[PDB]
Amino acid sequence: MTQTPDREKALELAVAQIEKSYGKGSVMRLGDEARQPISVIPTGSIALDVALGIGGLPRGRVIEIYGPESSGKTTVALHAVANAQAAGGVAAFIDAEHALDPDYAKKLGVDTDSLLVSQPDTGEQALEIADMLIRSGALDIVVIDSVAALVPRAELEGEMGDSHVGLQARLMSQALRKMTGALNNSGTTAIFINQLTTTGGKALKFYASVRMDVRRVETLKDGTNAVGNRTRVKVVKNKCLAPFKQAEFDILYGKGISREGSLIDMGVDQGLIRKSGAWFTYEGEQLGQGKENARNFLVENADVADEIEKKIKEKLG
Ligand SMILES: Nc1ncnc2c1ncn2[C@@H]1O[C@H](COP(=O)(O)OP(=O)(O)OP(O)(O)=S)[C@@H](O)[C@H]1O
């Protein structure tokens, strides 16, 4: 085929016709600029926000965060909550692990007091409770802790002959379908924490519109012991912007995600902040000597912090 121009035009209608029936994120080029909506739940880390493309989590979708135990998910999730919350939004927390610490959550910015919590007996109850709580069209964000802890009724009792094995993947399958509808039809985004899959996974893997692979990189040293960690997240799936994009941020013990720290790391890799060796400078005057001093600077001089964060959004968005 001695073609050339008439190709790019035909390929247009291809994609064009693909999206028209399968959705707008069905086909993409890893290079495509990202589409951008009105609502988006900031994750609390400008780095990851600019790796999700839309600058934060997508409403009306189902998000999946998975990875080793003690990676960062619940933090990354609780943050999403604090944001959705600080915008006058209401959130619920479906607990199947019984491992939430409000003091921490509160430090991150969660308004625990008005944080709706639920602790289901069986897995179905947990998902059925999340359903209506979703159909009310009142919740902004809902997070189910552990897709691996939602044991079906059967297993929880004595089981049945009929045909068992793989009761979750079904409990999930069924659930996910009935739910997907109410989600992308109410504007409530739902987060599913997965503990490192094949569990109830499969189902979710596909329904999920954004899949996050969270993992700890190093144990952030601090001259002393260990303030926080160096988490690395990678959107393995993302129907809202080109996927396979990754980000890294710090999680200070008891402090949570270091917004400021991200402000700096993104700052330098965007030319807005300079590095005169150990020295962190920003458009003239100095920020400090060493990322921590820098961070410690931004944390209090919160007035400038916002300036920098503001500009990075005018630079990429
Ligand atoms: N209650 C807490 N108090 C102090 N630090 C915490 C607390 N919960 C989490 N962290 C820190 O945050 C990081 C892990 O976030 P987690 O909430 O454990 O998320 P995961 O998403 O890692 O969670 P499991 O799956 O580990 S709860 C680590 O660096 C922890 O030290």
How far is the C-alpha of 269 from the C-alpha of 241, rounded, in Å?
Answer: 21
This structure's resolution (angstroms)?
3.2
**Experimental technique of record:** X-ray
**Number of helical H runs and strand E runs in the chain:** 10, 12
Q: Which of 104, 116, 105 is nearest to 82 (CA)?
A: 105
How far is the C-alpha of 123 from the C-alpha of 212, rounded, in Å?
Answer: 23
How far is the C-alpha of 47 from the C-alpha of 240, rounded, in Å?
Answer: 17
Q: Which amino acid is at 78?
A: L
What string of DSSP letters covers 115-163?
Answer: -EEE--SSHHHHHHHHHHHHHTS-EEEEEEE-SSS---TTTTTT--STT
By DSSP bridging, strand 210-218 and strand 62-67 are parallel
Take residue 70 and report the two structure tokens written for it.
Answer: 């003690």
Take residue 214 and report the two structure tokens written for it.
Answer: 């969270």
User: Among 73, 107, 230, 231, which is best to mutate for testing ligand 1, by the most ligand atoms less than 8 A from CB?
Assistant: 73
Burial 45-83 (b: 16+ CB within 10 A, else e): bbbbbbbbbbbbbbbbbbbbbbbeeebbbbbbbbbbbbb
Q: Using the mean position of ligand 1's atoms as its centre, give its distance from the Cα of residue 27 in Å.
A: 36
Question: Which atom of ligand 1 lies closest to the CA of 77?
Answer: 21
Q: CB burial class (10 A; 0-12, 13-18, 19+) of residue 188?
A: buried
By DSSP bridging, strand 228-238 and strand 279-282 are unpaired
Give me the architecture of the 258-317 domain, per CATH.
2-Layer Sandwich (3.30)
Q: Which of 206, 256, 258, 216 is nearest to 236 (CA)?
A: 206
How far is the C-alpha of 161 from the C-alpha of 167, rounded, in Å?
Answer: 12
Q: Is 72 annotated as a binding residue?
A: yes
Take residue 293 and report the two structure tokens written for it.
Answer: 């001093």
What topology is assigned to 28-257 in CATH? Rossmann fold (3.40.50)
Orientation angle between helical segments 291-300 and 302-315, nearest 10 degrees: 100
Q: Which of 197, 144, 204 is nearest to 174 (CA)?
A: 204
Q: Is 70 annotated as a binding residue?
A: yes
Residue nearest to atom 18 of ligand 1 (CA): 70
Take residue 190 and report the two structure tokens written for it.
Answer: 């739902």
Q: What are the sequence ranges of the domains in the chain?
A: 28-257, 258-317
Q: Which amino acid is at 72?
A: G
Burial 137-176 (b: 16+ CB within 10 A, else e): eebbbbbbbbbbbbbbebeeeeeeeeeeeebbbebbbebb
Q: Using the mean position of ligand 1's atoms as its centre, give its distance from the Cα of residue 252 in Å.
A: 10
Q: Using the mean position of ligand 1's atoms as its centre, give its distance from the Cα of residue 248 in Å.
A: 16
In short, whether 231's Cβ falls inside 6 Å of ligand 1 is no
Q: Using the mean position of ligand 1's atoms as its centre, give its distance from the Cα of residue 71 in Å.
A: 7
Residue nearest to atom 22 of ligand 1 (CA): 70
How far is the C-alpha of 241 from the C-alpha of 233, rounded, in Å?
Answer: 16
Instruction: Name the residue with tokens 């458009």.
Output: 283
Distance of CA 217 to the CA centre of its chain: 18
Q: Which amino acid is at 65?
A: I
What string of DSSP letters covers 176-198?
Answer: HHHHHHHHTTTT-EEEEEEE---
By DSSP bridging, strand 139-145 and strand 116-118 are unpaired
Q: Is 255 annotated as a binding residue?
A: no
Q: Using the mean position of ligand 1's atoms as its centre, give its distance from the Cα of residue 74 in Å.
A: 6
How far is the C-alpha of 284 from the C-alpha of 278, rounded, in Å?
Answer: 16
Q: Which of 120, 136, 132, 126 is nearest to 171 (CA)?
A: 126
Q: Is 23 annotated as a binding residue?
A: no
User: Among 45, 65, 253, 255, which is best to mutate for testing ligand 1, by the most ligand atoms less than 8 A from CB?
Assistant: 253
Spatial contact of 183 and 190, defined as CB atoms under 8 Å apart: yes
Q: Which of 143, 140, 139 is nearest to 74 (CA)?
A: 143
Q: Is 69 annotated as a binding residue?
A: yes
Can 28-257 and 258-317 be said to share one CATH topology?
A: no
